[PDB]
Amino acid sequence: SGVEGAAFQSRLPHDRMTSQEAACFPDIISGPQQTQKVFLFIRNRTLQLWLDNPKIQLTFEATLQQLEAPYNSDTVLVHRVHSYLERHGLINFGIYKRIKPLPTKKTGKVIIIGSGVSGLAAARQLQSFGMDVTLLEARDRVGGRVATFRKGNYVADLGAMVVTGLGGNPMAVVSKQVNMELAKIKQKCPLYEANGQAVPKEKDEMVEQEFNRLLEATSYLSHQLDFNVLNNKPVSLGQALEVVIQLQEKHVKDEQIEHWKKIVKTQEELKELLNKMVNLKEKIKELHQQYKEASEVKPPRDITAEFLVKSKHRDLTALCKEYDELAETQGKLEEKLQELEANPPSDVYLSSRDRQILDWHFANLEFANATPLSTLSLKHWDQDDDFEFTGSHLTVRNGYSCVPVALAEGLDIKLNTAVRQVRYTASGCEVIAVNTRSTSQTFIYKCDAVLCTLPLGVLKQQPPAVQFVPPLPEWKTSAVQRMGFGNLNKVVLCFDRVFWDPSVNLFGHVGSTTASRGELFLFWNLYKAPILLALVAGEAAGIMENISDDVIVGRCLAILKGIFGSSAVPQPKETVVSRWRADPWARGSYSYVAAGSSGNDYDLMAQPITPGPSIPGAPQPIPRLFFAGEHTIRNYPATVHGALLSGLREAGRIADQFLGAMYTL
């Protein structure tokens, strides 16, 4: 690695120019192969420089300082490259010691809706570019869908919990800037059935293998058999799973059918032989009498009498021969039938106990996507897989909230301010917002451009919680409706004594029915303080939100009593139950690729809005409305870093739009 590793860590091909690079450097990528390699080195080196020390700003002057020949000979290039990297938040993003204190005066006015991670990331950047930036948060806190319960020594995340590998992750930079205690997650997850008894490693491993097998099977249906539409309706992963399960239960019976179908045929083959064997014993019984009688004619006898004895003798011994040969075949068919009845094929595909354990595995996948599998696009549910980060997963031992709160610092944030209407036109934008405490009291915000970081579920509200004037074009609103916005909830249980296996990070719980498979199916042991964290996924997600905390906490304890003992489980000192779907400022947990939607809609979400002209016939204006968020990013949806990168992305686009691109000239 080294310089090539820097590109990797920055999610870039080291030996090739990107599509965005082609856009900004159309001279170089259309130029000679030599120039490109120079560019690519400067790009890769500059990333390395910033990555080696992410806590301080990396200036152009500092970059050129540490470049060797011939790479430092073209200083216009070094400048162009640096500016590009700085503009698009590949370097000098997050929280760093600023070398040249912020520009004396500020250019352009930007209002950012929401101070979630995407919102802050764009705010910190647009401020870095010397713009006038104000964030309008509805909540009484920063972070949005990153929320840490802090009370006494108890620390627990109700929102973002995991860092999904540091390999290529922009969060890896932030973790070196902010104080993040990142603890590795031991992926060893024991399962426990309804009664509280552990699942034998025999079952565990065979069912899990079948799970992964069933998934590859659905892919075969999707890609190889093109089973993607059924009755004008798009096929969901949930459906394809059922199809594949049923096809397996079918085959189990077809194998049984053709096995007994094979017994009846051998059962017949014997009957036909037995009838023949009976009729032969009949003729032997008769031919014995004829021989017996002919033998009574005592010698001496004439030759025709002699012949009769000898002749009947032959005729009888020949028929005895046959019968012995037919009794030979009887013995063979007889043991062949004891062979088949001794060992049939597979009795069943999955027992009651098997299916319940497999349902847990589905609950896992329902949690992973924050939605019942019956909604996930069969073709595209996993489209974002290729971009997964390397390295093991980690949790923030001190709570993820250190990151928003860190980023928030130094920014004009208006908490308790609910944006009711966004108005964008040729000459600018106004934001109509109320105070969340006294709702009938109002604020008006004038700005050049608006960055909307409203959670998809908020953009989904019917009636609209935020109104767009003019209305968003049908392409954008169809994107909003096609796309899925899931739900996932957490029960925080704060104890002051660890009754669980401390070396185990997480343990599962197997529900009784498919209906309730995602109900408290998973528990996390992650924090310093004796805190267990229970997950409510799938269909259970939404239904449990209507049930009071006590009843929910009750069910948790009951489950835990089953595993650990009726008296080993005290009353928790503190409990928290998230209800993301019911929460007006999220209206769900995070997006997913719904059936009928695709990865393309995510791009449509990021696409900015250019208003119509004031005067009819006047020129097409500047883009005014911009969109950042976890739902606006094709390659990292539903993730903190995904959100982060969208904020980083949008800031760049907006700055380019309002401060001009120096690096392209």
């Binding site: 974002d384 997964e388 599962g508």
Partner: peptide, 6 residues
């Protein structure tokens, strides 16, 4: 997303 799978 998938990466969230336990």
């Amino acid at each position: 997303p998938l990466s969230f799978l336990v």
